[PDB]
């Protein structure tokens, strides 16, 4: 891995997009496998 390419990958827009997509993928897979969670189940 070229260090300049890694430093470019460490910039705010790239990391922002990657982190928000990663978070969205967590929410999407959680709602795919555990849908319709209006509430915390008792």
């Amino acid at each position: 891995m070229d260090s300049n390419f890694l430093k470019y990958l460490s910039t705010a827009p790239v990391l922002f997009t990657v982190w928000l997509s990663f978070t969205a993928s967590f929410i999407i897979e959680a709602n795919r496998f555990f849908p319709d969670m209006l509430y915390f189940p008792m």
Partner: protein
């Protein structure tokens, strides 16, 4: 020779170092951020190449490679459209039953209940209905299978890769010199004869050799799976000659000028194909072949290495008269040194061409089964109208940028530009007066008619059942064009379009095209259009002509193209730049195109689009309400805005509910835009001071000091969210209405 190839080899090393240094292109920005303003400046001025360096050669190389990058993106988009047509569409079922299968080339995943958007579009398929018109284009091109669409997608991907490789090579490995870019005559010759001419010739070849037999078999009722492959149409001359017998005579009639033998597959029939509702493909094949001949002839005009050809500098300098001083002298240097002037001209022409495309494509449907696809027609008209308006305003903007930056008064003494500058006051005063006259005698007619209908005086209104404003000139032009076949166009079987007059072309009990009558309401709305276009011209031209100086600010050119103000002095000099004139002209372009598309939607839904039933009567979508309702603002408010929004607000729980969501969301964002538009920087900066105090109390203040957005950025953000909100609202309303009722 004078026109030659000069290239510098390896001018910029291919490296990732500057990828890690944001703002490397600007000496101001390369020092690094200190405020949040830096970030916005970094993303706002990045492709403004002329402000980073004074060398025209590097700017031209950057422009050439950025154009290659855009071409790569466009090819990737086209390849995506072909692939999504190939794999996620109902295209074969649409090919079997065009009049009953809604085109759909987008399928959603089921995640949170959004699978409800995969509506029942027919043909045993569920997906999002598409209105881009790709199905009709592929039917016109002779694409009968999804394998051909897969191959088209692969070709698009290969061309995208070729374009991005060409960009990398032609910037980073072999960059052309400034002398290579400054050949206008060679560029026009090659782009007229090779790009437009050979392109038209090869597409006429494809239309004649592939599109005509496949579409003739399709219109005769043959299923697509039994239609022969295109290469079989190429090699089996008998198979073609059953459909077009002139192919039995070969290329001998072409070279011996016995061209009428080819009259069966090169026609000038006009009108529309009764089976499909589109233009005859033979007419289009002769049309593109004639365009190829004309473009290749036009591509030999300009002087080159050999002695033949015209010199554009001599042509420009020869055209001068007693009213205009030196005439067109000095414009060749302007257009061969300033990229911004060329961008102004080309954006203006592309916008006007897009508007012409929208008008001429609704009125003369060129594709099979696109006329009765009312959502596709409305979508492509509205889309190309908006693109045209945006490109025209961009041409004005970049004209103003040329005027501020690249204009030199020493090289522009007593030419047309200097004399235009020298009577700018007369121009703007007369245009302002005619704009006020147009506003009064167009909008006050609507206000007057609203008051008269509200006062219970129907006989005092401007209407066809009251005091009339008859559009006699346009009706006379329509009568001439209806009478044109056989009188002034003796070789035409039918009119160029039935919108001027004639029969009702209907396909599958739906009106493909019918005559579009013009009355008092059409008079008033066309003069409203003229009023809005003249006011937009007033704003943009006043911004361009007063970009360098005025009676208010004598040194406006020193401040630049884009500055917020010159202070509160002289009474206040707010929004004095040409950029702010573009900022207001974008609003007025939005108003103009909005009124144009509202007129279009209502007039087609009320007088053109509809269902044909027994005894030949045409039942329109809104039942012919345009003549009596489009003469008042109340009629527009109730019978067009209130009436046709029922479909987007009752779309919840159906496949069109996303449009309703987008409707609300656009309603949100547009209103959010006014928060930027109505407010000012100092309030937000002091509120940011308080928030900075709050972050300082918890020792969580950022090193990059937060600042409010600039005054110019406040205007730009408000304008961008305003345009997005308005265009999205019209988008959702139009699409939901026309998918539901058409």
């Amino acid at each position: 020779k004078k026109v030659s190839i000069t290239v510098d080899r390896d001018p910029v090393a291919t490296s990732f170092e500057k990828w890690a240094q944001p703002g490397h292109f600007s000496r101001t920005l390369a020092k690094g951020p200190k405020t949040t303003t830096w970030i916005w400046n970094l993303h706002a001025d990045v492709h403004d190449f002329d402000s980073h360096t004074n060398s025209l050669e590097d700017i031209s190389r950057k422009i050439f490679s950025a154009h290659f990058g855009q071409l790569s993106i466009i090819f990737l988009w086209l390849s995506g459209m072909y692939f999504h047509g190939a794999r996620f569409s109902n295209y074969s079922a649409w090919l079997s039953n065009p009049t009953a299968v809604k085109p759909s080339a987008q399928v959603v995943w089921p995640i949170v209940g959004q699978e409800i958007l995969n509506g029942d579009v027919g043909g045993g398929f569920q997906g999002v209905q598409v209105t881009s018109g790709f199905f009709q284009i592929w039917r016109a091109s002779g694409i009968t299978s999804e394998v051909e669409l897969y191959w088209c997608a692969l070709a698009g991907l290969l061309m995208s890769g070729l374009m991005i490789f060409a960009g990398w090579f032609h910037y980073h490995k072999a960059a052309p010199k400034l002398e290579w870019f400054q050949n206008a005559e060679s560029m026009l010759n090659h782009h007229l004869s090779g790009l437009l001419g050979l392109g038209c010739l090869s597409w006429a070849g494809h239309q004649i050799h592939i599109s005509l037999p496949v579409n003739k078999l399709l219109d005769a009722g043959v299923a697509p799976q039994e239609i022969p492959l295109p290469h079989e149409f190429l090699v089996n001359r008998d198979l073609m000659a059953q459909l077009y017998p002139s192919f039995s005579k070969g290329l001998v009639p072409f070279f011996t000028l016995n061209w009428s033998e080819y009259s069966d597959f090169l026609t000038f029939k006009g009108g529309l194909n009764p089976v499909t509702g589109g233009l005859w493909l033979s007419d289009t094949a002769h049309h593109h072949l004639a365009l190829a001949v004309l473009f290749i002839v036009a591509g030999h005009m300009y002087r080159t290495n050999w002695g033949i050809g015209h010199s554009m500098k001599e042509i420009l300098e020869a055209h001068k008269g007693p009213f205009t001083g030196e005439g067109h002298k000095g414009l060749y240097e302007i257009l061969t040194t300033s990229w911004h002037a060329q961008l102004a001209i080309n954006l203006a022409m592309m916008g006007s061409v897009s508007i012409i495309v929208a008008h001429h494509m609704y009125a003369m449907p060129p594709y099979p089964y696109i006329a009765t696809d009312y959502p596709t027609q409305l979508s492509i008209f509205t889309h190309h109208m908006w693109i045209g308006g945006f490109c025209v305003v961009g041409g004005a903007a970049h004209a103003g940028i040329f005027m501020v930056r690249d204009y030199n008064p020493a090289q522009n003494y007593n030419n047309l530009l200097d004399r235009v500058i020298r009577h700018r006051d007369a121009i703007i005063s007369h245009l302002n007066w005619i704009c006020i006259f147009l506003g009064f005698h167009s909008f006050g007619l609507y206000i007057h008619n609203d008051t008269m209908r509200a006062l219970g005086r129907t006989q005092d209104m401007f209407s066809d059942t009251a005091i009339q404003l008859k559009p006699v000139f346009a009706q006379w032009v329509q009568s001439i064009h209806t009478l044109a076949p056989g009188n002034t166009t003796p070789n035409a079987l039918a009119t160029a379009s039935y919108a001027f007059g004639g029969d009702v072309v209907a396909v599958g009990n739906k009106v493909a095209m019918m005559p579009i009558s013009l009355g008092t309401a059409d008079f008033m709305v066309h003069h409203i259009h003229a009023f809005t276009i003249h006011v937009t011209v007033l704003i943009l031209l006043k911004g361009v002509l007063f970009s360098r100086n005025s009676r208010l600010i004598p040194d406006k050119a020193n401040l630049g193209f884009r500055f917020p103000c010159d202070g509160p002095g002289r009474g206040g000099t707010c929004q004095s730049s040409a950029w702010d004139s573009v900022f207001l002209g974008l609003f007025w372009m939005y108003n103009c195109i909005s009124v144009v598309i509202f007129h279009f939607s209502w007039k087609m839904q009320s007088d053109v689009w509809g269902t044909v039933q027994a005894d030949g009567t045409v039942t329109h979508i809104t039942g012919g309400n345009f003549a009596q309702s489009a003469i008042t603002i109340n009629g527009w408010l109730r019978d067009f805005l209130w009436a046709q929004a029922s479909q987007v607000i009752q779309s919840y729980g159906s496949a069109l509910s996303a449009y309703g969501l987008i409707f609300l969301g656009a309603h949100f964002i547009w209103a959010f835009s006014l928060m930027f538009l109505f407010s000012g920087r100092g309030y937000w900066q002091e509120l940011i001071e308080s928030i900075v105090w709050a972050h300082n109390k918890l020792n969580v203040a950022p090193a990059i000091q937060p600042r409010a957005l600039s005054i110019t950025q406040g205007r730009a953000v408000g304008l961008a969210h305003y345009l997005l909100g308005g265009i999205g609202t019209t988008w959702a309303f139009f699409l939901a209405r026309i998918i539901s009722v058409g």
